[PDB]
Amino acid sequence: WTRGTGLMSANNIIAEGIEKLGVRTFSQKEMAFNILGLLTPEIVQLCQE
């Protein structure tokens, strides 16, 4: 769940709601952090096998 602008502005009002279950949503700088961590040199060698 990425919380961003655009056409998902009608969905940001319930991100607080499903986070009360023990689940977490993400801002765009967080799914920035989460995919750039797939480019670490230990994942990079792991993708090659």
Binding site: G6, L7, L38
Partner: protein
Amino acid sequence: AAIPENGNGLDNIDSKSEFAHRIMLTNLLRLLGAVKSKKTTDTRPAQC
């Protein structure tokens, strides 16, 4: 890359959905399939 499409149900798979399926899949594979043919070196992988 993707297209914003919404309201296209199964009865309304329309031309914006055939163009979004080409953007997101049947020409994403041609994008990965073309970086393959331009590679000649097996020592440089391209992490998709």
